[PDB]
Amino acid sequence: YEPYATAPRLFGRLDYLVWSTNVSLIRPGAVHRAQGGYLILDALSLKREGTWEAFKRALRNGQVEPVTEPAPAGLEVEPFPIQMQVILVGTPEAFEGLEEDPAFSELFRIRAEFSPTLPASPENCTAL
Amino acid sequence: MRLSYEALEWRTPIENSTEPVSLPPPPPFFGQERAREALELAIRGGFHAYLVGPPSLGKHEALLAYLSTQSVETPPDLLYVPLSERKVAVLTLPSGQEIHLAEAVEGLQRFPQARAEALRRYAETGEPQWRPNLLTSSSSGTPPPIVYEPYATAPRLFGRLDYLVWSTNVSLIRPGAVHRAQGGYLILDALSLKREGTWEAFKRALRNGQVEPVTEPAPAGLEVEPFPIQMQVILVGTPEAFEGLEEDPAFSELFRIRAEFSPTLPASPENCTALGGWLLAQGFQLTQGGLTRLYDEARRMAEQRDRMDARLVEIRALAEEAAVLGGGLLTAESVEQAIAAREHRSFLSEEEFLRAVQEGVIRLRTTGRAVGEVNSLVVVEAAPYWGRPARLTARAAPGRDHLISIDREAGLGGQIFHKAVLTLAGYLRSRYIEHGSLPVTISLAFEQNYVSIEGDSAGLAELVAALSAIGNLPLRQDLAVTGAVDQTGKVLAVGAINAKVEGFFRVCKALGLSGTQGVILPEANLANLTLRAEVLEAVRAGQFHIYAVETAEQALEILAGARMEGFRGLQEKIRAGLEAFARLEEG
Amino acid sequence: EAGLGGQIFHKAVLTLAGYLRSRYIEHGSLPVTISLAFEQNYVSIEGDSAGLAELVAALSAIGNLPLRQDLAVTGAVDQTGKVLAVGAINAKVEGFFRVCKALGLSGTQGVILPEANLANLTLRAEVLEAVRA
Amino acid sequence: GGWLLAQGFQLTQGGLTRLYDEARRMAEQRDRMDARLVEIRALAEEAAVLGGGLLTAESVEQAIAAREHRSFLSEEEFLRAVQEGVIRLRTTGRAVGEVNSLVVVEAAPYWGRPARLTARAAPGRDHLISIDR
Numbered sequence: 016y017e018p019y020a021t022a023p024r025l026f027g028r029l030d031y032l033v034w035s036t037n038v039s040l041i042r043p044g045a046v047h048r049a050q051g052g053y054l055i056l057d058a059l060s061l062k063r064e065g066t067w068e069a070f071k072r073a074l075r076n077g078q079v080e081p082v083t084e085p086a087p088a089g090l091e092v093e094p095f096p097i098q099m100q101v102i103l104v105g106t107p108e109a110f111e112g113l114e115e116d117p118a119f120s121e122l123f124r125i126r127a128e129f130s131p132t133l134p135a136s137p138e139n140c141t142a143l
Numbered sequence: 144m145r146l147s148y149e150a151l152e153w154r155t156p157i158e159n160s161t162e163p164v165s166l167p168p169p170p171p172f173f174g175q176e177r178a179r180e181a182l183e184l185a186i187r188g189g190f191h192a193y194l195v196g197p198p199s200l201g202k203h204e205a206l207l208a209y210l211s212t213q214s215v216e217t218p219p220d221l222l223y224v225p226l227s228e229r230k231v232a233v234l235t236l237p238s239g240q241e242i243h244l245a246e247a248v249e250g251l252q253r254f255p256q257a258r259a260e261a262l263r264r265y266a267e268t269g270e271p272q273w274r275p276n277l278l279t280s281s282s283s284g285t286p287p288p289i290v291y292e293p294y295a296t297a298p299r300l301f302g303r304l305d306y307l308v309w310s311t312n313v314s315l316i317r318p319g320a321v322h323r324a325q326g327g328y329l330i331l332d333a334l335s336l337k338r339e340g341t342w343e344a345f346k347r348a349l350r351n352g353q354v355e356p357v358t359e360p361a362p363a364g365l366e367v368e369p370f371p372i373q374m375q376v377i378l379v380g381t382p383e384a385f386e387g388l389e390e391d392p393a394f395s396e397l398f399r400i401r402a403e404f405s406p407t408l409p410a411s412p413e414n415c416t417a418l419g420g421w422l423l424a425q426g427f428q429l430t431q432g433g434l435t436r437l438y439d440e441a442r443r444m445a446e447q448r449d450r451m452d453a454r455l456v457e458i459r460a461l462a463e464e465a466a467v468l469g470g471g472l473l474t475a476e477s478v479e480q481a482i483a484a485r486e487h488r489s490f491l492s493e494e495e496f497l498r499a500v501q502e503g504v505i506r507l508r509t510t511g512r513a514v515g516e517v518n519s520l521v522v523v524e525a526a527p528y529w530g531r532p533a534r535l536t537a538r539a540a541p542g543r544d545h546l547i548s549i550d551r552e553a554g555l556g557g558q559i560f561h562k563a564v565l566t567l568a569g570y571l572r573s574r575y576i577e578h579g580s581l582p583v584t585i586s587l588a589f590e591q592n593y594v595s596i597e598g599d600s601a602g603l604a605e606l607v608a609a610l611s612a613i614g615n616l617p618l619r620q621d622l623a624v625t626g627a628v629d630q631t632g633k634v635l636a637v638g639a640i641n642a643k644v645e646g647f648f649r650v651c652k653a654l655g656l657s658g659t660q661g662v663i664l665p666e667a668n669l670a671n672l673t674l675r676a677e678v679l680e681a682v683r684a685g686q687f688h689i690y691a692v693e694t695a696e697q698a699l700e701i702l703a704g705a706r707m708e709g710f711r712g713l714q715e716k717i718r719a720g721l722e723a724f725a726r727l728e729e730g
Numbered sequence: 731e732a733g734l735g736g737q738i739f740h741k742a743v744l745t746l747a748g749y750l751r752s753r754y755i756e757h758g759s760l761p762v763t764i765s766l767a768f769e770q771n772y773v774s775i776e777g778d779s780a781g782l783a784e785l786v787a788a789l790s791a792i793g794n795l796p797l798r799q800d801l802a803v804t805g806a807v808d809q810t811g812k813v814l815a816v817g818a819i820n821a822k823v824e825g826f827f828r829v830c831k832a833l834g835l836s837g838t839q840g841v842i843l844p845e846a847n848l849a850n851l852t853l854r855a856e857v858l859e860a861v862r863a
Numbered sequence: 864g865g866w867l868l869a870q871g872f873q874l875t876q877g878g879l880t881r882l883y884d885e886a887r888r889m890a891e892q893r894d895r896m897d898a899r900l901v902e903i904r905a906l907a908e909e910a911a912v913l914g915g916g917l918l919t920a921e922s923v924e925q926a927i928a929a930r931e932h933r934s935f936l937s938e939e940e941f942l943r944a945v946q947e948g949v950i951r952l953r954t955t956g957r958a959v960g961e962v963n964s965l966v967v968v969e970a971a972p973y974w975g976r977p978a979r980l981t982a983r984a985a986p987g988r989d990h991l992i993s994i995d996r
């Protein structure tokens with residue numbers, strides 16, 4: 016669960032030990048850590064951090080690029096087959112920015128909607 | 144006219160539901176004769192083309208498969224060579240020939256296109272970045288180069304300069320998509336060109352041959368000569384994505400060939416069979432039942448009994464879900480159940496609405512009779528577009544031909560909604576002239592409506608309610624109504640007719656079905672009724688009724704349970720209300 | 731008219747008009763100009779839940795009918811003069827109780843509200859005691 | 864004609880006449896031709912592919928037809944909706960206060976369509992009401 020969906024947090028980072036860089040200076044982001052499992056992001060953060068389109072490109076095309084700096088040269092990073100299930104979390108309203116994009120319903124086919132209220136029953140009093 | 148069950152049934156009969164389907168893959172572009180023949184043209188002429196159609200139709204998958212079948216002369220090798228120590232140019236030789244010359248140069252001639260001198264003075268002056276650069280090479284034009292770059296940034300399109308600490312030279316220049324597509328096809332999404340800001344540089348590439356590798360904000364660099372571009376570009380996008388593009392006269396100049404997908408196909412056995420082989424070639428284990436249910440869901444998606452939705456990516460996404468519910472097997476049940484689960488997963492707002500209706504928090508009648516009241520039908524703004532009844536009231540008082548749309552006056556109704564009310568007015572005034580101008584002020588309200596509403600499809604409901612209020616005619620509350628009207632009192636086709644009928648059924652069912660409920664709708668919309676199974680059963684059972692009409696008075700006779708003429712009919716009761724209102728109006 | 735009421739508020743007034751005009755037709759069109767004001771209101775107001783209060787006040791003004799001031803009212807109305815459910819019904823009842831109590835409870839105060847809202851009354855303990863008392 | 868040959872086309876008299884007459888029709892004037900040489904060439908490029916490299920009358924009439932086909936989806940939809948009675952149009956009989964007016968669709972290539980127009984007359988005080996307006 017990465018609540019703060021910035022490009023370095025999602026995709027990883029290149030460090031440069033003074034410049035060069037190479038395979039072993041590349042740090043993983045959340046997308047690397049969630050392979051073979053679940054990555055959870057908040058829909059508000061994707062919109063607020065501006066990372067929605069890069070994130071689609073990650074899921075639609077396998078492009079996951081570690082973040083570089085504005086200085087001198089760098090590495091081509093090959094796209095890999097992504098192996099993970101993403102769950103986005105947010106309010107009915109937070110998904111509205113997302114849902115104007117036909118790519119969203121294409122990628123997130125399963126809606127899991129909470130009711131704002133439950134039946135007032137002895138069983139729910141006991142659960143509470 | 145009454146619509147029997149037999150008239151409403153639209154589904155494909157299934158024989159041997161469980162039998163495995165076995166069918167060959169259809170060609171790319173099946174059902175899409177227009178876009179295939181535009182693309183064949185563009186391929187035959189070297190023209191650049193654009194593939195236009197709604198999202199989730201499968202346009203990129205069809206394009207890439209169709210491009211795989213093509214064949215061209217093997218592409219020349221592709222290089223940057225130095226024309227100087229601060230200058231480069233792009234060169235084509237004949238193929239394979241730069242593994243030579245890498246070393247022929249490496250003696251640090253024949254190869255007659257590799258002219259520019261221009262190397263030739265490090266002994267003339269002892270002066271202490273010259274080896275040619277291979278961008279690409281390949282062994283045949285079969286398949287031809289096919290480069291789909293979804294992310295159209297300047298480095299991705301045009302290549303990049305790296306600087307190994309600063310200098311740089313020929314051999315630090317990396318190719319972009321434009322270099323890789325030479326001698327073949329480059330595919331870009333129209334949305335990406337606009338979003339990455341790369342449309343003008345891209346034109347300059349195609350119009351002027353300027354292809355500049357991206358540099359950094361630091362210290363100096365290379366002039367890069369413009370080369371003769373050798374490639375066909377296909378852009379892909381929706382009808383809307385090309386609109387930003389099309390305000391630019393350069394776009395239609397460069398992309399002369401439009402390849403437009405239809406959003407629907409004919410619903411024929413040939414397209415059902417194509418769909419079936421397409422699914423198997425995608426990997427599904429499919430049964431005849433699952434195939435029929437998917438084909439009939441595609442017709443219902445299209446809201447037309449005669450057409451199927453052409454969006455192959457949507458059909459697959461639903462078969463993916465069905466396949467999980469069938470334990471890996473794509474069956475009739477798994478598909479009807481994947482459908483039901485989608486509705487359940489979006490049904491919270493309806494579950495709330497139904498409960499508020501059951502508690503009387505929303506006041507609705509689905510039985511009895513009332514004057515000047517009608518269940519009109521609306522479709523909820525957010526997907527998946529559930530329909531609901533909306534109570535509509537009309538009240539008539541003595542006054543000076545005013546038709547008052549309360550919703551329109553309070554700022555809740557749109558322009559099309561307003562137009563329907565104006566058109567009703569036009570009908571009323573002109574149809575009832577005995578007293579001069581109409582002696583009544585009618586007001587119409589959508590009783591529990593808190594949001595903006597738009598559309599003309601409540602015109603019929605409004606006009607019946609107004610006529611009822613004029614004539615004091617009790618109307619059945621067990622029948623809901625949708626339909627537009629023209630000034631001549633003719634009923635016209637409306638949208639979302641499945642969601643409207645079904646949403647009245649759902650309200651009737653949560654309140655307990657009385658046996659006589661149903662919906663009156665445009666005769667013009669028969670070919671759009673592709674009703675869910677539960678409604679068709681209820682109609683077959685006698686427990687729900689659909690009436691299609693051509694005129695507003697036909698709807699009023701049904702709701703008032705009387706004839707307009709045969710005179711103790713309705714028309715004389717309307718005229719008597721109007722005479723009553725005309726007398727009240729002069730003391 | 732002064733720009734303080736919203737569109738839904740305006741809709742309630744239009745709907746009341748529809749009710750009045752159509753319910754009282756003996757003279758032709760209604761022989762009265764009614765004006766309605768929220769006396770000390772300085773801000774924008776919105777909602778349909780004062781329709782009932784507005785329509786009773788207008789009927790009272792037509793007929794010169796003295797109305798009890800010890801009972802407050804909330805409720806929307808439709809064109810047929812039916813009372814419809816409104817929001818925030820606990821806060822409305824309780825806030826009248828609080829004003830009655832700070833002024834000294836007379837014994838006869840209370841609130842008239844939609845039958846449609848019974849299942850939303852979950853009133854605080856102090857109000858239920860006062861009703862019990 | 865000499866401009867096309869100097870551009871490299873293999874042109875026949877038929878292809879040349881059909882191109883010149885398409886330029887007049889482009890201009891919408893029998894007396895004038897469209898002066899846009901780059902458009903005329905782009906169409907002759909397409910004709911030349913359909914003529915197997917030869918610019919003939921047929922290849923030009925057929926390049927014209929293929930352009931219309933490639934943009935004809937919206938008309939194919941409109942025609943089908945008209946045939947199904949989803950759009951209500953009459954093209955025979957008579958009717959009072961009804962006329963087929965004609966409009967041109969906003970997006971290129973500017974297809975024309977009939978649009979049913981109705982007028983209704985009632986007794987009243989010199990008002991001409993444009994509902995659409």
Ligand SMILES: *[B]([O])([O])[C]([C][C]([C])[C])[N]C(=O)[C]([C]C1=[C][C]=[C][C]=[C]1)[N]C(=O)C1=[C]N=[C][C]=N1
Pocket residue numbers: 519520521522523524525533560594595596597598599600601637638639
């Ligand atoms: B009919 O189809 O024209 C009908 C007319 C009547 C209810 C006023 N209209 C609607 O069903 C419209 C369809 C629509 C949906 C989304 C955007 C625009 C139009 N629905 C509504 O107007 C609507 C709006 N808000 C909430 C619920 N319904």
Ligand SMILES: *[B]([O])([O])[C]([C][C]([C])[C])[N]C(=O)[C]([C]C1=[C][C]=[C][C]=[C]1)[N]C(=O)C1=[C]N=[C][C]=N1
Pocket residue numbers: 964965966967968969970978
């Ligand atoms: B006529 O040429 O003046 C005619 C008048 C009538 C139909 C109202 N007008 C049109 O044909 C106009 C031409 C036009 C096209 C594009 C922009 C502006 C004007 N067409 C339309 O108004 C029109 C608009 N939207 C859809 C279809 N047609």
